[PDB]
Structure formats: C-alpha cells, structure tokens
Design a protein around this ligand. Structure first.
Ligand SMILES: CC[C@](C)(CNC(=O)Nc1ccc(C(=O)Nc2nccs2)cc1)N1CCOCC1
Ligand SMILES: [Fe+3]
Ligand SMILES: [Fe+3]
Length: 300
C-alpha cells in the first residue's frame, strides 16, 4: 500500500482509530481519559463488527459521548439505530436536513432496504431503536463542536453530493472529515472520482470553499481511510479538477451523438469495483447514470 494513505483498521494517530471495514469506516476519537466520539455512521450489517472493534479501545461504552454524521446516505448512518441503544450517553450530531431525513417514513424506508440488501444470510441485526427516536442534536453551518479539551471541530456546509452534506474540520490538527464531498478516492490510480448526486454547482462551490481552509495535513473521506501528505493538501483542488474533467468528457461524448447510457456503463465498468461489497449491484450503475444526468443538465 501507499504511505500517503492509511488504510488499515486500528490506530491512525495518537487520538484516532479506524473501526470496522476501511471501505465503510467508523472513526473513533479519544477526547479524554473517559470521553470518546465517533465520526461517520456506516452500514447496518457492520454493527457487530464495529461494536467488537469499539470495545477493544473503549472499556466502558457509556464514555462514547458524541457521534458525528456527514450526510443521510444509507452507507453513512446505517449503524445508528443498532449501536445507539448500546451507547447510553451518546449524542448524534447532524445537520438539520440530515435530521429531517430520519423523520421521513419514506426516506427511512429506503435506508433500511438498501442496508438489508447487504446482510449475509447468516446474520440478523441487533434490536434497533426507531429512527425518529435517535438521540440527535442538530448542528448548523459554522457551528463549533466543543467535543473536548483538545478537540474543537467546525461544522461546514458542503452541499452537492447530497442536499444535506456537511464536513467537520479540526483546525488544531488540520484534519478534515470530508464525507463524500470530494468524491470517491481511486485507490489504484490516486485520483478522486466525482460523486455529484444532487447539484453540480453546489458541489463545485463547496470544493472552492474547502480549498480556502488552512492547508490540510489529514483528509478523511467517507470511504477508504486517511489521506495525508500532498493528498490532503491538494485534495479539494484535485477533486474540483476531476469533476471538471468528467464534465468535459461528458460534453465530448454527447457531441459525438452518444447516449448518457454509454458513458454510464463505461463509468460503472471503470469505477464500480471499489464499492461492490457495500453498494448493491445496479445501484452503482444507476448512481453513475444519475450523476451524468445532473452534469448534463447543468452544462448543455
Ligand atoms: C436518506 C435519504 C435516502 C434514503 C438516501 N438514499 C441513499 O442513501 N442512496 C444512495 C444511492 C447511491 C449511493 C452511491 O452511489 N454511493 C457510492 N459510493 C461510492 C461510489 S457510488 C449512495 C446512496 N433517499 C434519497 C433519495 O430518495 C429516496 C432515498
Ligand atoms: Fe454519499
Ligand atoms: Fe458514501
């Protein structure tokens, strides 16, 4: 593997561990002698794996006090109903629009269906509390999250991947939990693959704003581990560049009379392998289709 990417479970930094699977990770922050936080909310089927990992670092789970959520997609909040009942003192921190999703009977329905397609036939889930009963506290754009004496993270709105997406910036550590706002990091090639599933202008505008942060040392997306060195410092600029590259490519093929379905199958072919173990079959191709439709509307 590559020294600019930390992609193994376990300790990542003095205060930081990766729990569960690197492809859909949950990050553990040590806030103090008896205080911890989680960041990112995973897929439901990983409940017992993430729990087992957690208990290796946290002897008393009533010490997990915060759980930070970047956005409402099924692969970023699927653990909450299954692990929150095991964390009696936790407070889920999420944006207003993310919290709204969990009160929508129809939105919750899709999160559950997508997660249940990932269950192995062997396993059943733990007893879950209701989605509208999660211990949540809505956070707003620009709010400072005073998690502990050495952990202060700023909430930054970063719409475009989804209409609710936020990121969390630890300025003391030049550390950005960026969710899917920069896209999907390509592990074989070292570049970002765009994930524009709501609004292209918002996605680009968010990346512009994130480039203005003080130089990053650690960049932690929703999938694939921790990026450092030049990958963190240039991440938001590079993600912006790769989005434009995809737009140009789409414009090029359309101008040769190609249907969106052509570049869609090509993109699914080139990029679908990374997420095949947590993104159900037709969903990735459908996702590529939806992205190209969004790019095509906001550029033709
Ligand atoms: C809570 C609201 C929600 C249930 C959210 N829906 C999802 O979570 N869908 C979803 C679909 C595709 C990807 C995807 O392609 N991920 C990738 N990761 C890597 C490469 S592509 C991720 C998530 N709504 C939204 C639409 O209305 C009804 C359902
Ligand atoms: Fe997402
Ligand atoms: Fe995701």
């Amino acid at each position: 593997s590559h020294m600019l990417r930390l992609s193994a479970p376990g300790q990542l930094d003095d205060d930081l561990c990766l729990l569960g699977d690197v492809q859909v990770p949950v990050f553990l922050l040590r806030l103090g002698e008896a205080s911890w936080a989680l960041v990112e909310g995973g897929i439901s089927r990983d409940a017992e794996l993430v729990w087992a990992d957690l208990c290796r670092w946290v002897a008393d789970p009533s010490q997990v006090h915060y759980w930070l959520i970047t956005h409402k997609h099924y692969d970023h909040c699927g653990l909450l109903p299954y692990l929150c009942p095991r964390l009696p003192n936790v407070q889920v921190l999420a944006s207003e629009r993310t919290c709204q999703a969990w009160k929508s009977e129809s939105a919750v329905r899709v999160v559950e269906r997508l997660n249940r397609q990932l269950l192995r036939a062997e396993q059943r889930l733990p007893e879950a509390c209701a989605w509208d009963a999660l211990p949540v506290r809505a956070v707003a754009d620009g709010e400072w999250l005073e998690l502990g004496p050495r952990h202060r993270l700023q909430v930054i709105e970063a719409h475009g991947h989804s209409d609710d997406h936020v990121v969390f910036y630890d300025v003391r550590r030049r550390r950005l939990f960026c969710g899917d706002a920069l896209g999907e990091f390509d592990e074989a090639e070292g570049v970002w693959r765009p994930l524009v599933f709501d609004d292209m202008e918002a996605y680009l505008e968010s990346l512009e704003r994130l480039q203005r942060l003080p130089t990053l040392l650690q960049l932690i997306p929703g999938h694939g581990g921790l990026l450092r060195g030049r990958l963190a410092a240039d991440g938001a600029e590079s993600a912006y560049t790769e989005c434009l590259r995809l737009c140009r490519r789409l414009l090029w093929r359309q101008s040769m009379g190609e249907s969106l379905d052509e570049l869609s199958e090509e993109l699914h072919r080139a990029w679908g392998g990374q997420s095949v173990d947590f993104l159900p079959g037709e969903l990735h191709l459908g996702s590529m289709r939806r992205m190209l439709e969004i790019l095509s509307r906001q550029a033709l």
